[PDB]
């Protein structure tokens, strides 16, 4: 909301004459009490010959691209200057604003007698933008006839010593979107008497002598007040005086005709939007009713709106007059020949206007004030103020007829309920001991009726303050007017906390551990790539395709939430590779979204109580499963190239090692088992188990998936479900025997298909407690042992707890281990050795 300081100063000055403050101080005071000041614009300065001119002659220059005009301009004292201008929104006889040779326009432009388009141009005719007077639009500024004589000083006529304040009013302060409301706020801040510009001393009521039009109101539309008054026989050719067109321009409104201009002016002045109907274009009774399915209205701008059965209209016998609270319609629109005007002063339902305007994308000046509740007490006063002013400008009478529907039964008293609040409650909440009588003085300034009953005030807020409705609301009024800067900084004592949880501590350890091992964390996106599961070649019934779906995504082809973190990880990989960073390991710890049934929403639960355990359980059950995952991808070189050697490309074993890093970080033991599971390679994919619970997969990606996806050849990947990895808090007590160890190496021949870990387990199982360590050295194949067999060489370290192991005692333990491998995996001993 833009408005100019002069107008705001004028309204404040009625009850505190002589009031005046710098823009700086005004900006600061506005911020301190709660109003965001987006910009402070003083009206761009001019120097020198910038005066009113009158266009005495126009000559259309032909032969150029656009239409150009050589103009004779009367600039004062019977001097006529020739001026080139490219606009077209002016005729002979029009007052304009000329910047003449020697003048300096805002932006540091000096005007000079140039030659242009074949003629001499002694300056230029100005636009409201070029003078930093108002918004840039097509064409130059034209002053209304009789605003000033040719030769008058531009800066004084235009009022360029004024400053416009651009504010962002918060939706709880609708009353502040007008000179009325902001002026009241300043009188509160500055401790001034305030004369309300909507009151009767300042708007004397016009007569009330019978209805002004037939009106039926379906009251379930939420209309709270609906008033009409007519002004007849107005000059359709009159224009608004300069002072009024100016104030509208500084407020962001382009003036058009007195019928419209006067309703925009009173809207800005008092905060009650208004509308002017061409009365002679209404047919019959005015009806306020809901719209029907499929109904249409054409609004002032000539655009057909598709309506909705929750939209409130004004209709007559013939057509639609208004989308009530949002925008008038074409059928009763004031237009060039309109002589008899019916003025609408309505109070619509805030939620109704909100829904309708969002749905139609019509955030009009009217709608935005109704959304935030307009003061119903001032409808007739805004009506009367508006009628007098229209008659005064365009010269008709104000008919003494008046409709004033005020509900059924009529509501005569618009005040909210009273609020009971303890007198020191603002003191407690602020942590300040305010001077005595402070809370009651400040609530008085904002227009509430305050009465004392010991320690308990009763506060009845004014009608323009529907936001003031609990004691909390009243505290904010006291605290903001006293200033928030007076509130001290006092650390609270917080109780002994329990610190971070196991799961939180585990996710940090997983991240530190992966980052040290060379992985770079990304923030994954939860919006899947389009068709990623078709690229992976997933079956139609694969659980990962059952995705939750967003309904208004920022990319229309990426609306599915992720059931897996790999898509986002692979996306960041592709980005790194495409920028020349080809040796990359990335990881993510984030939640997935895995829905169980269909999207089942739970109905609204009353918020005047807490939900019951059953209601919470039902809300939880309605949401998708959202477990925490950890995932990683690797491509390129795992070990970089350097003096040591050429480096080592990523292989599936590096993803297996990433499982082991995560598991070590989680203090749990894993087992890897061969598995087939897209998007992994079928012979290089492992399913990960903690105990007997599957927790995810790891390995190399399927080369077909890599190819269809544009991934680096050989990309590996790992994904684990962190919710499936149980907590462990081990309390180890390692036996550390100091007696000498015995080292023996044993080679076993097994079927190629037997996993190496199976052979190690079998050797450990049979060897017993004497086996301190087992480790795989060699995996050898060759013809002499069998085309489908392989030799595994294990390094065994034996150690006794109480004695030095004899070497025969160790060989007994080996024999037992070899026999166990025979019985379990069919192993055949090939040879043993005393590791030297």
């Amino acid at each position: 909301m833009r408005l100019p300081y002069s107008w705001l100063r004028e309204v404040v000055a009625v009850g505190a004459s002589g009031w005046d403050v710098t823009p700086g101080e005004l900006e600061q005071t506005l911020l301190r009490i709660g109003h965001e000041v987006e910009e402070v614009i003083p009206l761009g300065p001019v120097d020198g010959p910038v005066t009113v001119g009158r266009v005495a002659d126009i000559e259309e220059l032909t032969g150029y691209k656009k239409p150009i005009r050589a103009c004779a301009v009367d600039i004062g004292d019977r001097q006529y200057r020739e001026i080139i201008c490219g606009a077209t929104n002016f005729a002979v006889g029009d007052l304009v604003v000329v910047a003449l040779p020697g003048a300096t326009l805002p932006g540091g432009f000096t005007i000079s007698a140039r030659k242009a388009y074949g003629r001499n141009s002694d300056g230029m005719i100005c636009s409201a933008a070029e003078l930093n007077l108002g918004a840039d639009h097509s064409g130059i500024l034209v002053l209304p006839p009789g605003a000033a004589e040719p030769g008058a000083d531009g800066a004084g006529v235009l009022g360029l010593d004024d400053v416009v304040f651009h504010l962002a009013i918060t939706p709880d302060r609708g009353y502040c979107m007008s000179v009325r409301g902001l002026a009241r706020e300043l009188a509160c801040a500055y401790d001034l008497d305030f004369v309300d510009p909507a009151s009767n001393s300042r708007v004397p009521p016009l007569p009330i002598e019978g209805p002004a039009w037939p009106l039926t109101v379906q009251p379930e539309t939420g209309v709270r007040r609906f008033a009409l008054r007519p002004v007849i026989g107005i000059d359709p050719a009159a224009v608004s005086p300069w002072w009024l067109q100016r104030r509208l321009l500084l407020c962001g409104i382009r003036a058009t005709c007195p019928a419209v201009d006067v309703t925009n002016y009173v809207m800005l002045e008092l905060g009650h939007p208004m509308h002017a109907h061409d009365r002679n274009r209404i047919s019959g009774t005015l009806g306020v009713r809901f719209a029907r399915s499929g109904e249409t209205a054409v609004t002032l701008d000539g655009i057909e709106r598709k309506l909705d059965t929750a939209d409130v209209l004004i209709v007559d016998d013939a057509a639609t007059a208004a989308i009530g609270g949002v925008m008038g319609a074409a059928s009763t629109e004031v237009r060039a020949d309109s002589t008899d005007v019916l003025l609408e002063a309505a109070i619509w339902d805030p939620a109704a206007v909100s829904r309708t305007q969002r749905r139609l994308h019509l955030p009009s000046e009217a709608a935005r004030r109704y959304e935030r509740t307009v003061d119903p007490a001032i409808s007739v006063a805004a009506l009367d103020r508006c009628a007098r002013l229209l008659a005064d400008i365009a010269g008709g009478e104000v008919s003494p007829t008046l409709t004033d529907w005020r509900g059924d039964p009529p509501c005569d008293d618009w005040s909210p309920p009273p609020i009971r609040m303890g007198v020191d409650v603002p003191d407690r909440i602020a942590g300040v001991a305010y001077p005595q009588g402070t809370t009651a003085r400040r609530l008085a300034q904002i227009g509430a009726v305050v009465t004392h009953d010991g320690d308990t005030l009763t506060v009845t807020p004014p009608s323009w303050r529907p936001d003031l409705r609990q004691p909390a609301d009243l505290v904010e009024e006291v605290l903001r007017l006293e200033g928030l800067e007076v509130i001290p900084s006092v650390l609270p004592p917080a109780p002994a906390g329990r610190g971070l949880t196991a799961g939180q501590q585990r996710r940090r350890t997983i991240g530190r551990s992966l980052a040290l091992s060379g992985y770079v964390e990304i923030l994954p996106t939860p919006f899947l790539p389009a068709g990623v599961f078709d690229l992976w070649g997933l079956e139609a019934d694969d659980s990962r395709r059952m995705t939750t779906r967003v309904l208004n995504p920022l990319e229309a082809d990426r609306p599915q939430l992720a059931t897996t973190l790999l898509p986002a990880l692979l996306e960041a990989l592709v980005r790194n590779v495409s920028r020349g960073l080809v040796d990359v390991a990335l990881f993510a710890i984030a939640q997935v979204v895995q829905p169980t049934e269909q999207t089942r929403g739970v109905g609204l639960i009353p918020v005047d109580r807490r939900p019951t355990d059953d209601e919470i359980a039902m809300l939880d059950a309605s949401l998708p499963r959202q477990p925490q995952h950890v995932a990683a991808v690797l491509a390129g070189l795992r070990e970089p190239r350097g003096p040591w050697g050429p480096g080592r490309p990523v292989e599936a074993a590096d993803a297996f090692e990433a499982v082991r890093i995560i598991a070590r970080a989680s203090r749990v033991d894993v087992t890897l088992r061969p598995a087939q599971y897209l998007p992994w390679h079928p012979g290089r994919c492992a399913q990960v188990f903690v105990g007997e619970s599957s927790v995810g997969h790891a390995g190399q990606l399927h080369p077909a998936v890599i190819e269809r996806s544009g991934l680096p050849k050989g990309t590996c990947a790992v994904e684990l479900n962190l919710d499936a990895i149980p907590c462990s808090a081990p309390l180890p007590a390692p036996r550390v025997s100091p007696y000498p160890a015995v080292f023996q190496d044993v080679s076993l021949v097994v079927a190629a298909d037997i996993p190496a870990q199976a052979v190690a387990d079998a050797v450990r199982a049979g060897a017993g407690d004497l086996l301190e360590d087992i480790a795989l050295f060699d995996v050898f194949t060759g013809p002499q042992i069998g085309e489908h067999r392989k030799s595994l060489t294990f390094a065994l370290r034996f150690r006794a707890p109480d004695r030095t192991l004899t070497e025969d005692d160790a060989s007994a333990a080996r024999d037992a281990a070899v026999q166990s491998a025979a019985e379990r995996v069919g192993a055949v001993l090939r040879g043993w050795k005393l590791a030297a």
């Binding site: 002994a496 551990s513 079928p682 012979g683 290089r684 309390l731 100091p738 190496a756």
Partner: protein, 267 residues
């Protein structure tokens, strides 16, 4: 060519089995290490008290007799000193020693900071005990000190009980029964109810506590009529021994990698 794509795929799927691997092979070419289990216990203790608003203090291990004894209300000729328990710095009558507990660190903190003071201090400490299964001459201690207005034994017990829950489970609590230390009055010995194990819950002697003696408050410029203080201390090797069931403290101090590795990395 339905059957063309069929076997042109079947041979393509066997190219994938041809290039299979034993996914159970070892992958760890950078074997993991281990932060020391005492250090990790200290870390867990420190995190427990930080999370209650307290702060960690540290100080030298070679310390002045002023701070290790005289400020702690423990004079020259009191029954006992370092004829029998303290390592003394040469030469004889230099008033330097290896600290025997971390209280001098608490004493330094009281000189250096404004009140109130809530302070944990964890550090290496030195006693002339021969190394055996239940004693080490080089050990690690935790101590606490709360100095504020209005502190009581009730607060001492609440802190001790929070500490026990952190290190021993939600079923744990403490009992105190009177003892004597020169720097506290009343003094008490602290027993912890070790529910989670021990092979059947029992009380275990944990450490000692008490209200800070007024002579200690005067020797640090604090008016004992306005401020009171409590304090406690527990030995970390002791705590680890009976919590984890570690029969031989030599394993804690000797540096065998086999003792640390099973405790994990500590990251």
């Amino acid at each position: 060519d339905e059957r063309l794509a069929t076997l042109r795929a079947e041979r393509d799927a066997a190219v994938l089995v041809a290039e299979g691997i034993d996914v159970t092979l070892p992958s760890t070419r950078v074997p993991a290490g281990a932060r020391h289990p005492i250090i990790m216990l200290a870390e867990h203790v420190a995190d427990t008290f930080i999370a209650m608003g307290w702060e960690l203090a540290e100080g030298p291990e070679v310390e002045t007799e002023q701070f290790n004894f005289d400020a702690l209300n423990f004079p020259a000729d009191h029954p006992a000193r370092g004829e029998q328990d303290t390592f003394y710095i040469a030469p004889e009558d230099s008033r330097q020693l290896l600290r025997t507990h971390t209280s001098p660190v608490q004493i330094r903190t009281l000189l250096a900071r404004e009140l109130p003071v809530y302070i944990i201090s964890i550090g290496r400490t030195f006693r002339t005990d021969e190394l055996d299964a239940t004693h080490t001459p080089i050990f690690h201690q935790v101590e606490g000190l709360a100095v504020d207005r209005g502190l009581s034994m009730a607060h001492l017990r609440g802190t001790l009980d929070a500490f026990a829950r952190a290190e021993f489970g939600p079923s744990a609590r403490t009992r105190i029964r009177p003892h004597f230390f020169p720097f506290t009055e009343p003094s008490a010995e602290v027993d912890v109810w070790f529910a989670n194990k021990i092979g059947g819950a029992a009380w275990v002697e944990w450490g000692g506590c008490g209200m800070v003696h007024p002579n200690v408050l005067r020797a640090t410029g604090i008016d004992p009529d306005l401020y009171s203080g409590f304090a406690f201390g527990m030995g970390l090797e002791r705590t680890l021994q009976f919590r984890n069931g570690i029969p031989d403290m030599r394993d804690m101090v000797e540096g065998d990698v086999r003792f640390s590795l099973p405790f994990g990395v500590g990251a």
